[PDB]
Every structure is written in structure tokens, then in C-alpha cells.
Amino acid sequence: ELKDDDFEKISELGAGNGGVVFKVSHKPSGLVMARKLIHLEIKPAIRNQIIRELQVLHECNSPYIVGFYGAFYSDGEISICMEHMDGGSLDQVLKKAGRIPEQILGKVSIAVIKGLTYLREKHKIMHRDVKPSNILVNSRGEIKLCDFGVSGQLIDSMANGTRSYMSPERLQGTHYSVQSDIWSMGLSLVEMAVGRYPIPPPPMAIFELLDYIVNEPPPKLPSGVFSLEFQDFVNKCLIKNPAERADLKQLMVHAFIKRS
Ligand SMILES: Nc1ncnc2c1ncn2[C@@H]1O[C@H](COP(=O)(O)OP(=O)(O)OP(=O)(O)O)[C@@H](O)[C@H]1O
Ligand SMILES: O=C(NOCCO)C1=CC=C(F)C(F)/C1=N\c1ccc(I)cc1F
Ligand SMILES: [Mg+2]
């Protein structure tokens, strides 16, 4: 259904480690979509795997997950086509917005945790990559998650900087899982709250950095400037220990979101 020649570059939405994304127009349909090119030097068998595994994204419908239209391969570059969210990613919003208010972070948290639990229950997958830039917003006030790990093979093929939102345990070994996403969210809401990457507490090299998050105490929210309920919420996400750390059920019925 989706083909390379059937598209038309409109503008460029942004870029990261391994992917470029364009605001594009799907001629046959008129739909404005976001198209993500991932450059992969890869053999036909696996190139087909990744595509085959991306089909699952047709079954990912939630108001908390970014819509998916199709995926295909075109000249050394794999394509994922998705809902264009005309507000961009929270990392952008933060840059232009200085710091994001506690009340809004509240709406954001609701969405992220609803999004995570949907991917867990209905599809049995962890997100693996939650952080401000993988949470998209749109003018209809929607707040959706993208770039979650639906395809093992694509994670593989992409085995290949500054900030990390990876959990202490994921940083330390392969002994991690869905609990790891919670830490990410924790860290992301702290970032967006204060307007700055919260490590170290208010220019740091890779080991300094990575060593801080695994050996030094977790970041906390500034005091007095944020409700005690926001504090406890973040605090329960950022607990070094995966088992002690809040799980998805517990955060759903936490005070902070209840207030939200
Ligand atoms: N569906 C979409 N709708 C609107 N904007 C998008 C969409 N997907 C990505 N973007 C924007 O384009 C950028 C592309 O992000 P991409 O996933 O390629 O790298 P990243 O996630 O920002 O960072 P990294 O890959 O380094 O983790 C994002 O920062 C976001 O601003
Ligand atoms: O984009 C990724 N990582 O981002 C890194 C910068 O390219 C991805 C990594 C692993 C996967 F399985 C992915 F599907 C995936 N991409 C998407 C997943 C869901 C939607 I809705 C849209 C996506 F684009
Ligand atoms: Mg992304």
C-alpha cells in the first residue's frame, strides 16, 4: 500500500542517531504524514524481517500511541510512516518553552503511563527509549509515545552520545526490563520540570556522567517549588532499584495523577 515514489518531501522535522524525519505528503491520499528514514546497510532477508515486524504497528491503536500507516524499504534506507504531530516533541517544546509547568507535566505523565501500560498489556512490549523527544504532542492537545521497541531485529541492526535516560540497571548489564522505562519517565519529567538535564544536580564527560547515574544518589525535584505529590511521584520512579522502584500499576493510582 505505501511506496517510495508515492511521496513528496515538504520540510524536515528533525534528526537523530540513525534516523531523519520529514513532513511529507502521501500523494494518492492527500494525508500529511511523518516519514522516518533509517539508513541501514543490510541484507534482503533481514530488511524483510524488520518490515514484517513493523506490521504489528497497524495493531497499535491508542490515543497515547502515535499512529502508524506503513513501512517499506527504499535504497539503503528503511521507512516508517506515521501521524504528523504538528506540535513536535517535548524536547523541542521545552527548548522554546524554558521549563514546563507542573500541571502540564501532569497531563504528560498521565499520557506516558497510559501509553506504556497499553504497550505492555495489549502487545507485551516495553518501550525501551522514553525521553522528551520520543513523546510527541499535537494541536488537538494529544500527547503520544513513539519510537518504542516493536521490532527486535531493528533494535539489533541499530546496535550503533551526551545525555542518557537509561536506567542504572540497563546501564550496568542486560538484567533489565519494563521497569527500566519508569526510570526514563522519571528522569524526563525532572528534566522538563527544571528546564535542564538533571545530571549533575543544579559540562560533564561520558564516564563522569554514566558513573553518576549508577553510583551517585538519584536526582530529586527542587523543594518548595513543586507540590509534595509531584515530588513523591518522581521519587518513586527514580529509585535505583528496579524491584523497589514503582511499577506501572502503582503509578496509575498515585496521588499526583489522581490530582491530575
Ligand atoms: N511523528 C512525528 N511527528 C512530528 N515530529 C516528529 C515525529 N517523529 C519525529 N519527529 C521530530 O523529528 C525528530 C526526529 O527524531 P528521531 O527519533 O529521528 O531522533 P530523536 O528521537 O530526536 O533522538 P535520538 O534518535 O537521538 O534518540 C524528533 O526530535 C521530533 O522533533
Ligand atoms: O525510531 C526508533 N528509534 O529511533 C531512533 C532514531 O531513529 C525505533 C526503534 C525501534 C523500533 F522497533 C521502532 F519501530 C522504532 N521506530 C518507531 C516505532 C514506533 C513508531 I509509532 C514509530 C517509529 F518510528
Ligand atoms: Mg524519536
From Swiss-Prot:
Modified sites of kind Phosphoserine: 157
Activity regulation, short description: Ras proteins such as HRAS mediate the activation of RAF proteins such as RAF1 or BRAF which in turn activate extracellular signal-regulated kinases (ERK) through MAPK (mitogen-activated protein kinases) and ERK kinases MAP2K1/MEK1 and MAP2K2/MEK2. MAP2K1/MEK1 binds KSR1 or KSR2 releasing the inhibitory intramolecular interaction between KSR1 or KSR2 protein kinase and N-terminal domains. This allows KSR1 or KSR2 dimerization with BRAF leading to BRAF activation and phosphorylation of MAP2K1.
Catalytic residue list: 129 (proton acceptor)
Enzymatic reactions: L-seryl-[protein] + ATP = O-phospho-L-seryl-[protein] + ADP + H(+); L-threonyl-[protein] + ATP = O-phospho-L-threonyl-[protein] + ADP + H(+); L-tyrosyl-[protein] + ATP = O-phospho-L-tyrosyl-[protein] + ADP + H(+)
Uppermost EC category: transferase
The Protein kinase domain, residue ranges: 7-257
Tissue localization of expression: Widely expressed, with extremely low levels in brain.
Subcellular localization: Cytoplasm, Cytoskeleton, Microtubule organizing center, Centrosome; Cytoplasm, Cytoskeleton, Microtubule organizing center, Spindle pole body; Cytoplasm; Nucleus
Entry EC number(s): 2.7.12.2
Keyword list, A-Z: Acetylation, ATP-binding, Cardiomyopathy, Cytoplasm, Cytoskeleton, Disease variant, Ectodermal dysplasia, Intellectual disability, Kinase, Membrane, Nucleotide-binding, Nucleus, Phosphoprotein, Serine/threonine-protein kinase, Transferase, Tyrosine-protein kinase
Binding-site positions, ATP: 13-21, 36, 82-85, 89-92, 131-134, 147
Function in brief: Dual specificity protein kinase which acts as an essential component of the MAP kinase signal transduction pathway. Binding of extracellular ligands such as growth factors, cytokines and hormones to their cell-surface receptors activates RAS and this initiates RAF1 activation. RAF1 then further activates the dual-specificity protein kinases MAP2K1/MEK1 and MAP2K2/MEK2.
Annotated disorder: Cardiofaciocutaneous syndrome 3: A form of cardiofaciocutaneous syndrome, a multiple congenital anomaly disorder characterized by a distinctive facial appearance, heart defects and intellectual disability. Heart defects include pulmonic stenosis, atrial septal defects and hypertrophic cardiomyopathy. Some affected individuals present with ectodermal abnormalities such as sparse, friable hair, hyperkeratotic skin lesions and a generalized ichthyosis-like condition. Typical facial features are similar to Noonan syndrome. Melorheostosis, isolated: A sclerosing bone disorder characterized by hyperostosis of the cortex of tubular bones, frequently involving one limb. The lesions may be accompanied by abnormalities of adjacent soft tissue, joint contractures, sclerodermatous skin lesions, muscle atrophy, or hemangioma.
Free-text note on domains in this protein's UniProt record: The proline-rich region localized between residues 270 and 307 is important for binding to RAF1 and activation of MAP2K1/MEK1.
Protein name: Dual specificity mitogen-activated protein kinase kinase 1
Originating species: Homo sapiens
Residues of the full protein shown: 62 to 364 of 393
